[PDB]
Design a protein around this ligand. Structure first.
Ligand SMILES: [K+]
Ligand SMILES: [K+]
Ligand SMILES: [K+]
Ligand SMILES: [K+]
Ligand SMILES: [Mg+2]
Ligand SMILES: [Mg+2]
Ligand SMILES: [Mg+2]
Ligand SMILES: [Mg+2]
Ligand SMILES: [Mg+2]
Ligand SMILES: [Mg+2]
Ligand SMILES: [Mg+2]
Ligand SMILES: [Mg+2]
Ligand SMILES: [Zn+2]
Lengths: 100, 147, 99, 203
RNA sequence: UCUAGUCCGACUUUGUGAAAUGAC
């Protein structure tokens, strides 16, 4: 994201102007919660447990069927982006569970 | 204007100019563009070649502002300079006027025609054709690019 | 109709631009893809209610097809297509007359 | 601050704790009529974020609605028309089950104003919602600046004009820009505006 | 070219067990 070259074509084209960083906004921390919210969600996970399909994912990760675990996650959740995020969450749960 | 309408001249002539045999019926050849391939085939092929069929690539949500590029030719470049500035151009040959076509709502400079004789001009534009640049240079001028 | 297995014909490839040896094989129409835009539109049009939404040809008249020879150049390994006249019996590399 | 715990627990609907509680509640609701007054919301945390307040004038009703599509209500499944319109099943109502629950409560409770509603349970045959209604005539409501707007005549039968939260969803108003632009100010208003033939004086 | 109905399968309603057999 270099300053514009002043030419109408090519890389970094555009009118020459002094660029500046946008002023910080409260919405910049969207997607971040307080420490209490993380504490509450962690506690409820202990009380509630895991869903049946999440149990299926972790069972596949124990036998090392990582590829099949992701396909199950995508079929359930729907998107590849959410599926691979869910698989990493199950791996993290299993990773620190086998170490206890 | 009703009094000039030719139907008035046809009052008392029975058929109103549409004939006794053929008559004036409702839609004896179909409505609008009906039968373009069947009974109006000759008309379409003779007067509208290329009407039927598909050509080229689609462009979903095509915005015309992205393609905005008004052009000005070499022969019209001198007319942009104010008359009072034209006299100054002929009064001092050491300097040359700077014609920024963008200030007059033009992006690209094309090369149709010729420049005034013995008058160098510095042309400022976003884009320029090779012939336009050659004609500007051979007249003693220069080209500057902007955006 | 009998056609030889090999044929020496002109090659349009910029590498050759000359007469070269070609291997003769018969063209066969490939499988229709489900992802082709025309198929995608047809499936959308056919969905829901309304029944058959496109014509279905029924009055077949031709008893033959225009066989297309697939000529693969042996130099540049490129293919050219050469249709022949209609025929009911066609083969490539069959026994020549007399022999 | 206890509502976050309750709300997060209700996000785990497939857990053993919730599956048990929902299973028992689903049986209980089936035995009762399709519209029932409840002494207090089953989901206080969910209710108060939709505008519910624990004060006189606010009432909660549970509404039961049948599930599935909309069979075309035509005798013997016979349609007199072209094949494109001959479908009878696999047709879907343009309004949602949540909207239907609000309309059922609104029509029955003509003396109250529908504020909002929320999902509480479902089975294969029925879907259950709780509808929050306001007694606009109660003094506690009329003296409350945050809710007394609903006492004005323009807000009569919000649910029957598609003006509730569920109403905005099925009208296409939850969203804007290139994907929702035809829904504002209304779908039929957009059509009439675009169909208008403007014949100016000097044309 | 379609359709009510009807037959059929899957998912859902739908939980608690056991055995046989099979897969990972
Ligand atoms: K006439
Ligand atoms: K259709
Ligand atoms: K009809
Ligand atoms: K039609
Ligand atoms: Mg006459
Ligand atoms: Mg007549
Ligand atoms: Mg005629
Ligand atoms: Mg006419
Ligand atoms: Mg569809
Ligand atoms: Mg269908
Ligand atoms: Mg009370
Ligand atoms: Mg507009
Ligand atoms: Zn070749």
């Amino acid at each position: 994201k270099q300053p514009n070259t002043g030419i109408s074509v090519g890389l970094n084209k555009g009118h020459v102007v002094t660029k500046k960083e946008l002023a910080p906004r409260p919405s910049d921390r969207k997607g971040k919660t307080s420490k209490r919210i993380h504490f509450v969600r962690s506690l409820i996970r202990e009380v509630a447990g895991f869903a049946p399909y999440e149990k299926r994912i972790t069972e596949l990760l124990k036998v090392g069927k990582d590829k099949r675990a992701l396909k199950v996650a995508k079929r359930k959740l729907g998107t590849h982006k959410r599926a691979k995020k869910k698989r990493e969450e199950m791996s993290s749960v299993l990773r620190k569970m086998r170490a206890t | 204007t009703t009094r000039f309408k030719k139907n008035r001249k046809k009052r008392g002539h029975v058929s109103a100019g549409h004939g006794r045999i053929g008559k004036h019926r409702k839609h004896p050849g179909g409505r609008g563009n009906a039968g373009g391939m069947h009974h109006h085939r000759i008309l379409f092929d003779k007067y509208h070649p290329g009407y039927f069929g598909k050509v080229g690539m689609r462009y979903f949500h095509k915005l015309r502002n992205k393609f905005y590029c008004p052009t000005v030719n070499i022969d019209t470049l001198w007319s942009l300079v104010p008359q009072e500035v034209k006299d100054k151009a002929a009064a001092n040959k050491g300097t040359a006027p700077l014609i920024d076509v963008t200030q007059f709502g033009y992006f690209k400079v094309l090369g149709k025609g010729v420049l005034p004789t013995g008058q160098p001009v510095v042309v400022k534009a976003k884009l320029i054709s090779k012939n336009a640049e050659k004609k500007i240079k051979e007249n003693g001028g220069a080209v500057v690019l902007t955006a | 109709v009998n056609v030889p297995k090999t044929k020496k014909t002109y090659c349009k490839s910029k590498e050759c631009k000359k007469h070269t040896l070609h291997k003769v094989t018969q063209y066969k129409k490939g499988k229709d893809s489900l992802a082709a835009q025309g198929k995608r539109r047809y499936d959308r049009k056919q969905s829901g209610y309304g029944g058959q939404t496109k014509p279905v040809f029924h009055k077949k008249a031709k008893t033959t097809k225009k066989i297309v020879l697939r000529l693969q150049c042996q130099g540049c390994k490129h293919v050219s297509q050469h249709p022949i006249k209609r025929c009911k019996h066609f083969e490539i590399g069959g026994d020549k007359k007399g022999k | 601050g206890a509502y976050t715990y309750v709300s997060e627990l209700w996000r785990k609907k497939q857990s053993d704790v919730m599956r048990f509680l929902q299973r028992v509640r689903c049986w209980e609701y089936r035995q009762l009529p399709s519209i029932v007054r409840v002494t207090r919301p089953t989901r206080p945390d969910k209710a108060r974020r939709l505008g519910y307040k624990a004060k006189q004038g606010y009432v909660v009703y549970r509404v039961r609605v049948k599930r599935g599509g909309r069979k075309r209500p035509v005798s013997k499944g016979i349609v007199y028309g072209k094949p494109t319109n001959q479908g009878v099943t696999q047709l879907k109502f343009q309004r949602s089950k949540r909207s239907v629950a609000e309309e059922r409560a609104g029509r029955k409770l003509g003396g109250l104003k529908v504020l909002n509603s929320y999902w509480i349970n479902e089975d294969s045959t029925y879907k259950y919602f709780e509808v929050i209604l306001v007694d606009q005539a109660h003094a506690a409501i009329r003296n409350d600046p945050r809710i007394n707007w609903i006492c004005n005549p323009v807000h009569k039968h919000r649910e029957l004009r598609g003006l509730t939260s569920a109403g905005k969803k099925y009208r296409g108003l939850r969203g804007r820009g290139h994907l929702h632009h035809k829904a504002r100010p209304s779908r039929r208003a957009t059509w009439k505006r675009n169909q208008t033939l403007s014949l100016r004086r000097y044309r």
